[PDB]
Design a protein around this nucleic acid. Structure first.
Ligand SMILES: Nc1ncnc2c1ncn2[C@@H]1O[C@H](COP(=O)(O)OP(=O)(O)O)[C@@H](O)[C@H]1O
Ligand code: BEF
Ligand SMILES: [Mg+2]
Ligand SMILES: [Mg+2]
Ligand SMILES: [Mg+2]
Ligand SMILES: [Zn+2]
Length: 642
RNA sequence: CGACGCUAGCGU
RNA sequence: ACGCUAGCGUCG
């Protein structure tokens, strides 16, 4: 690769030693920029001094790719390149691995753990730190944690040769800024977080850049929601019935929208605090009652954004997971109206006008350009399958050869994700979710459809990375009309972003270097200023059947994070099944998923820790607590001796 | 099992 | 400003 002139331009500040945030559009080759930087940095040292670079990537695919490029590139120059990720994290001398390698590709969460564990004494070991997607440096994110460590050693009395810090991104973001001054403040905060005295962008070479990356034309499609109440009418009855069945027990109480969802979750929270014998029958009934009631609320939301068939099949798939006592009654109410709902799904006149417009868009582009590659973004993983079936089930769309991309959680694994991206060069169109955010550098697309897709200014600028080619088009399809305005804001926010950067770049240096020091200092003492056990024995009950699980005295903590149970008393209370994720995370190894032996509620997982094979539980499956952090009791460290 | 980010809704 | 709920994604 012959370096483009603007790649040198973006590299210039970093090569002169300044801490720099490099802001350039996706696909412009920011990767090769960090190579030029990194190469220049190592060759600046005299014999008897060696530089040590750490490249950060917060996604495994990006991690593996960088380690590949860097290794192939820098092997010739006599620099040893290595990497450490979650799989290679455990049972290795991290300190010596860092010591014996000149360039090190890393996940940030690993450097955080090694700093906290003390295995890595200080960042002074590194002469250079490169943050990829540096806009993630903020809040509690791992990137920011690494910099908190960096900032304390700076502002503290502790003296060390702190590393040069570089960062990379297509956008810094304006945050919540309503204007230039607020936007300029947010960017200044980020610069301080990364200790950057310079924001680098293409200026002199702009004409070259725009012949590489092109800004795809954006279109706003405002449609209308279906007026037909036929489908939601019957289900509104079913939900109205389940409301009575629940009200037929507790007798006390305090819509297919999001507001209604938070209620049913609150109802369940209210039913779990409710003789102890009939109590289990009551709680289990309410749990099963609200569960179906909550999944009926889902079938509504789906019917709005997709076919009625997709919602009916979502229930048809649900009730299949129900079977294999009070469930037989509720499925009876469904089976009763099912015959009627089967016909409503078959009626073409009731078709979603939001889909018809999406169909129309797809017909035009492929009629114009049959070689079109498309990415269709959606919100929920459920809606991913709903549209998959819709395309293959549409005679008009027959030219489409759809494929799916999702995250891990129904979950799609990494090799499953990669398997789709390779066929996307067989696959005509890719239905997906936010996984595409920050980019995997997948196949180029001349068409990008945003289906009820809300996001920030950063994701917006990133998603263009699919449309680098001239003539690429992007559509936004929503019936809400609030989604339109939300995107409009982001467009204005990008303007504020680029205006503020130009305005910041005019400032004399050493004045700005002074301001970031003033931003760092204020942020430090507030960060240091933000910082009672209960020895009583409490009983942990299963949130579903309220059966006895174990006592707080039994529970031990593993490495300050994970909670387990001691004794064979617990072993009679649960069952287990192998879950198809035999991957080792951290010190553990995932083997099977735990279930209630009474019920079948998910308690936690059964793993392998060192020599011992021991279960691990989550409190949110057992007053109620969402996490163990919120649960205050005497924490007994797990002792190998017992 | 845990941590973290984004979006929407809600509350001091 | 934080907190809570859900969706979505990522990492250990
Ligand atoms: N000077 C260059 N000449 C030709 N291709 C380049 C050059 N620099 C980068 N690329 C190509 O850009 C592609 C992706 O760019 P990338 O490094 O991911 O930039 P960004 O991080 O901004 O998205 C790479 O596959 C690479 O082949
Ligand atoms: F590197 Be790109 F901006 F995702
Ligand atoms: Mg990149
Ligand atoms: Mg090694
Ligand atoms: Mg992230
Ligand atoms: Zn149970």
């Amino acid at each position: 690769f012959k370096p483009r002139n603007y790649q040198l331009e973006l590299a210039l500040p970093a090569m002169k030693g300044k801490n720099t945030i490099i802001c350039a559009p996706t696909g412009c080759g920011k990767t090769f920029v960090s190579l030029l930087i990194c190469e220049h940095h190592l060759k600046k040292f005299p014999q008897g001094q060696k530089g040590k670079v750490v490249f950060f990537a917060n996604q495994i695919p990006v991690y593996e790719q960088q380690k590949s490029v860097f290794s192939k590139y820098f092997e010739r120059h006599g620099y040893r390149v290595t990497g450490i990720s979650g799989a290679t994290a455990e049972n290795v001398p991290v300190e010596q691995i860092v010591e014996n390698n000149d360039i090190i590709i890393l996940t940030p969460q690993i450097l955080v753990n090694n700093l906290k564990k003390g295995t890595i004494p200080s960042l002074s070991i590194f002469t250079l730190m490169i943050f990829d997607e540096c806009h993630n440096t903020s809040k509690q994110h791992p990137y920011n944690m690494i910099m908190f460590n960096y900032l304390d050693q700076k502002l503290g009395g502790s003296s060390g040769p702190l590393p040069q810090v570089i960062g990379l991104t297509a956008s810094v973001g304006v945050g919540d800024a309503k204007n230039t001054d607020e936007a300029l403040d947010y960017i200044c905060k980020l610069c301080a977080s990364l200790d950057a005295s310079v924001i680098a962008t293409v200026k002199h070479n702009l004409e070259e850049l725009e012949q590489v990356v092109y800004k795809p034309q954006k279109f706003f499609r405002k449609v209308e929601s279906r007026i037909s109440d036929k489908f939601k009418y019957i289900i509104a009855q079913l939900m109205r019935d389940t409301e009575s069945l629940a009200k037929r027990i507790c007798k006390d109480l305090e819509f297919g929208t999001q507001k209604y969802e938070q209620w049913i979750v609150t109802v369940q929270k209210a039913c779990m605090v409710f003789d102890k014998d009939e109590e289990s029958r009551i709680c289990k009934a309410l749990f099963l009652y609200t569960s179906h009631l909550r999944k009926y609320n889902d079938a509504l939301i789906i019917s709005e954004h997709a076919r009625m068939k997709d919602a009916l099949d979502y229930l048809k798939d649900f009730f299949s997971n129900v079977r294999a006592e009070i469930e037989q009654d509720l499925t009876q109410r469904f089976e009763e109206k099912l015959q009627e709902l089967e016909s409503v799904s078959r009626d073409p006149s009731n078709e979603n006008p939001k889909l018809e417009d999406l169909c129309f868009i797809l017909q035009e582009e492929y009629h114009l350009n049959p070689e079109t590659i498309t990415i269709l973004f959606v919100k929920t993983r459920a809606l991913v399958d709903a549209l998959k079936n819709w395309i293959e089930g549409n005679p008009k769309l027959s030219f489409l050869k759809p494929g799916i991309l999702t995250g891990r959680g129904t979950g799609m694994t990494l090799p499953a994700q990669k398997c789709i991206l390779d066929a996307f060069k067989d696959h005509n169109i890719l239905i997906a979710t936010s996984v595409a955010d920050e980019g995997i550098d997948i196949a180029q697309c001349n068409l990008v459809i945003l289906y009820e897709y809300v996001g920030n200014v950063i994701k917006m600028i990133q998603t263009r990375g699919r449309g680098r080619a001239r003539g690429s088009k992007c559509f936004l399809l929503t019936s809400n009309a609030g989604v339109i305005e939300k995107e409009q804001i982001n467009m204005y926010k990008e303007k504020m972003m680029n205006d503020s950067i130009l305005r910041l770049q005019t400032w004399d240096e050493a004045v700005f270097r002074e301001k970031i020091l003033h931003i760092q200092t204020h942020e430090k003492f507030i960060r240091d200023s933000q910082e009672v056990p209960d020895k009583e024995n409490k009983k942990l009950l299963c949130r579903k059947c309220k059966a006895l699980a174990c006592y707080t005295a039994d529970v031990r903590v593993i490495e300050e994070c994970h909670y387990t149970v001691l004794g064979d008393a617990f072993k009679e209370c649960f069952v287990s099944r192998p879950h198809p994720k035999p991957k080792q995370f951290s010190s553990f190894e995932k083997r099977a998923k735990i279930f209630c032996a009474r019920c079948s509620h998910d308690w936690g997982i059964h793993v392998k820790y060192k020599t011992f094979e021991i279960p691990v539980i989550k409190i949110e499956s057992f007053t109620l607590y969402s996490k163990w952090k919120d649960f205050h009791f005497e924490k007994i460290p797990f002792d190998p001796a017992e």
